[PDB]
RNA sequence: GCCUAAGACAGCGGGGAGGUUGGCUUAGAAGCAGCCAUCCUUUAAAGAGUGCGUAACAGCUCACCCGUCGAGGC
């Protein structure tokens, strides 16, 4: 049998137990050099919640380690440099980034995202910097989605 | 008729006289981020919409019926079950080879004929074959006719 | 008076997706203790989720879409 496992670890900072060891332990695979393999590969996320699928063989105890990007509300919240976003969202604000932050959200996250282009994929982005209080560009993020449907920013993209 | 039917019917006629070959896919017990993956990859190659066979049948007899050919006419005759106009330029062989490409492996279905050979496959043991990780069918667009200049092409004949 | 052979209503089957385990809180809070928001996308359509469930997940549901059936439902 092949078993895929998914989950969210720390990134660089992997270990055996538990949320890998209860996981990959009983496939009979060295814990080890899966939380090595996790920890190479998550050198640049350090101490950010990271996602990371292991796709083991249960027979021949081999596997390979595909990670991932972090959730975008760690991203948004790593641009700002924030410990903790809105208590309230929509009546307080977090911080505010620019467009052109949220362009780098937007871009480093198209291939997960299932929109196609730049633009509905800030979009995407901009509704969750809604769902936390963080403000793009002194405005609401819907008041700006719904601008760049009017093309107000047709000079960034493409 | 309800508002929207009238509506999406036009949007289907228009689809049909949109482009040369004219395909009939299903659709039918597809998983939806399997959808989304199909739809990403056919994207600049055919045009895709959905909708009631009942409502496609319409437009199909109309769009025939006023581009003065029965040989639209006739697509109507094969749809069946989720039930979806495509159409595009590339040739229905073309087009079963792209579509054939974009089928993703899938857990076989409880009762389900299992087409690699006859069988019905019980439901515990789907549900066993399920629990393994076990994916053996082949799932994706699926032809149930395309147009192309006078003639129908049926699967019959498009394989091989 | 409004839905209904362009298929209602009722049963059943398949879809029920992605950003994303939304933000917060919380030992845990993943649609589903609680507070806040409740957008965007792929769409036929699929709620930042109706009710189960879980310690949290899972799984099941429900909305909504397709599909069956064929005559009235209100
Ligand atoms: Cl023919
Ligand atoms: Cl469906
Ligand atoms: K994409
Ligand atoms: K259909
Ligand atoms: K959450
Ligand atoms: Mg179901
Ligand atoms: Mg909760
Ligand atoms: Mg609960
Ligand atoms: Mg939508
Ligand atoms: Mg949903």
Known sequence: ?158 | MAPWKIEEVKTLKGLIKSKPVVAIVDMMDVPAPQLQEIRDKIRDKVKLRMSRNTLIIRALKEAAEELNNPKLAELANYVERGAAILVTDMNPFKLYKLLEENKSPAPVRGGQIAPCKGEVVSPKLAAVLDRLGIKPIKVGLNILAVYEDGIIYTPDVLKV
């Open chain 1, 1 to 158: 049998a092949k078993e895929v496992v998914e989950v969210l670890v720390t990134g660089g900072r992997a270990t055996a137990g538990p949320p890998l060891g209860p996981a990959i332990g009983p496939l009979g695979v060295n814990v080890m050099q899966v939380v090595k393999e996790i920890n190479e590969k998550t050198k640049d996320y350090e101490g950010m919640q990271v996602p990371v699928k292991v796709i083991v063989d249960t027979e021949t105890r081999k596997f390979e380690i595909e990670v991932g990007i972090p959730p975008t509300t760690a991203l948004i919240k790593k641009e700002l440099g924030i410990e903790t976003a809105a208590h309230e969202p929509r009546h307080e604000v977090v911080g505010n980034l620019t467009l052109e932050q949220v362009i780098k959200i937007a871009k480093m996250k198209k291939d997960a995202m299932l929109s196609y282009t730049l633009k509905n994929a800030v979009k995407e982005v901009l509704g969750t910097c809604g769902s936390m209080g963080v403000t793009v560009e002194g405005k609401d993020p819907k008041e700006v989605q719904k601008e760049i449907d009017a093309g107000v920013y047709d000079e960034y993209f493409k």
